[PDB]
Amino acid sequence: ILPDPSKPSKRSPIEDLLFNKVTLADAGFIKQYGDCLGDIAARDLICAQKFKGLTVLPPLLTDEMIAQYTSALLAGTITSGWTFGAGPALQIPFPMQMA
Amino acid sequence: VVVLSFELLHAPATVCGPKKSTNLVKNKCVNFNFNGLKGTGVLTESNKKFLPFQQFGRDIADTTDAVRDPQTLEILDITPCSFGGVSVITPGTNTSNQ
Numbered sequence: 699i700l701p702d703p704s705k706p707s708k709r710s711p712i713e714d715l716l717f718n719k720v721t722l723a724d725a726g727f728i729k730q731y732g733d734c735l736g737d738i739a740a741r742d743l744i745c746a747q748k749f750k751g752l753t754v755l756p757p758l759l760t761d762e763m764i765a766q767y768t769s770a771l772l773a774g775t776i777t778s779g780w781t782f783g784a785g786p787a788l789q790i791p792f793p794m795q796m797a
Numbered sequence: 798v799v800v801l802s803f804e805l806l807h808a809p810a811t812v813c814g815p816k817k818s819t820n821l822v823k824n825k826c827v828n829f830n831f832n833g834l835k836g837t838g839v840l841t842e843s844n845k846k847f848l849p850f851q852q853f854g855r856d857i858a859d860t861t862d863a864v865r866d867p868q869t870l871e872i873l874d875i876t877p878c879s880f881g882g883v884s885v886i887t888p889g890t891n892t893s894n895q
Contacts, residue, residue, distance in 0.1 A: 731879045737844045
């Protein structure tokens with residue numbers, strides 16, 4: 699469940715499963731009316747709509763910021779318990795947290 | 798009494814009105830006219846394979862996407878002029894006019 703520095707994205711070996719199993723429509727936003735050319739158009743489903751007046755906007759938080767947030771939550775919880783959510787963080791050994 | 802019966806443009810036509818043809822220009826977004834098919838867009842050479850009995854193309858919205866040049870018999874593509882949307886970022890007229 700902890701981040702893996704080895705991969706280029708710093709996801710966890712479970713977040714990788716969760717990302718490879720859900721098939722999106724078009725990852726990223728590279729179209730920018732510089733892709734839809736010749737027979738490459740009228741076959742993809744993204745150009746067929748962009749030519750009609752329907753577009754998709756990108757979210758504000760990228761997929762690499764949400765991973766940072768979740769890693770922060772995990773590190774805080776496993777190093778300090780429930781104390782970091784109600785004031786300053788205070789450390790405690792883990793097998794003395796399970797008690 | 799004479800009866801005239803005819804069918805409109807769906808196959809290669811043979812009888813037209815008295816109109817003179819201009820030069821063919823590509824890669825510039827123009828307003829064209831092919832045997833009465835009027836529109837606007839960019840024309841580029843295609844890779845589609847039309848069979849001899851045929852000259853037009855269609856998409857799921859039933860709009861023309863390719864056409865056979867009625868003088869050279871080559872397949873062209875149609876694509877609208879690029880467009881978009883515009884947004885303005887302002888800090889407030891009380892502060893500045895930039």
